[PDB]
Design a protein around this ligand. Structure first.
Ligand SMILES: [Cl-]
Ligand SMILES: [Cl-]
Length: 249
């Protein structure tokens, strides 16, 4: 059967490993990014104290929901009236567990899916619309750029930095060989980049394996890097990965 390398951050990695194990798929976890919470600056705290200026808040990732909820809880006994948005169901559920109503697409692989969602566009129907994006220190500029194009002002709240964990030399190749892995999962472009960087000289070998990517954009990024077997899952969730595994080899 399928024997997969997972490369997602540690917390999301364990939840995926468990789902895959429950479905009877073997996996080995090698997080290619670690999540380092950011120290809130005075300018960032001000954004949070003025959270009620935003008609929508977009949470781009599971760590952004977790860390973003900490600051919400810190500064808001009662959350202001605004629309909370997510790209996927899995990010939405962290917010939902807190008690928020979340706007998100059902297909939901990428920023585009949220951007095109009628419920999301409706939340922008406001005088001088302002949106807050909760995310890492860096990321995709697409959503901000597009929102600004429609006359929406866009602020970022960085919550964490993403860094490559330090592994003993050869960890990636050792894992693929020792665990007889026949597939790789990445869940983002940065994750895919870190994989290429860590593969280094063994990339011709590693790039050979079925590479399961969450979206068309990441699929394109992977071809550009020389990955020979690029597989587009319809999103980053476990069910999406299972359906993609069934269809592949
Ligand atoms: Cl992954
Ligand atoms: Cl970052």
């Amino acid at each position: 059967g399928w024997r997969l390398l997972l490369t997602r951050p540690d917390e999301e990695c364990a939840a995926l490993a468990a789902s895959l194990g429950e479905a009877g798929v073997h996996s080995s976890s090698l997080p290619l990014l670690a999540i380092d919470p950011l120290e809130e600056t005075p300018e960032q705290r001000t954004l949070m104290l003025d959270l009620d200026r935003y008609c929508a808040v977009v949470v781009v990732s599971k760590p952004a929901a977790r860390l973003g909820l900490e600051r919400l809880d810190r500064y808001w006994p009662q959350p202001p009236q605004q629309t909370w948005c997510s790209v996927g169901a899995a990010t939405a559920a962290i917010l939902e567990a807190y008690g928020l109503d979340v706007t998100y697409p059902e297909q939901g692989d990428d920023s585009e899916a949220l951007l095109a969602l009628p419920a999301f566009q409706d939340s922008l129907r406001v005088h001088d619309p302002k949106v807050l994006i909760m995310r890492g220190e860096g990321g995709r500029e697409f959503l901000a750029e597009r929102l600004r194009g429609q006359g929406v002002q866009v602020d970022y709240l960085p919550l964490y930095r993403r860094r490559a964990p330090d592994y003993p030399a050869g960890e990636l190749l050792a894992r693929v060989r020792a665990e007889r892995l026949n597939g790789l999962v990445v869940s983002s472009g940065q994750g895919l980049q870190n994989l290429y960087q860590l593969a280094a000289a063994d990339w011709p070998e590693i790039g050979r394996l079925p590479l399961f990517v969450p979206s068309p954009r990441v699929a394109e990024m992977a071809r550009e890097l020389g990955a020979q077997r690029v597989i587009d899952c319809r999103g980053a969730s476990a069910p999406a990965l299972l359906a993609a595994l069934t269809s592949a080899a």
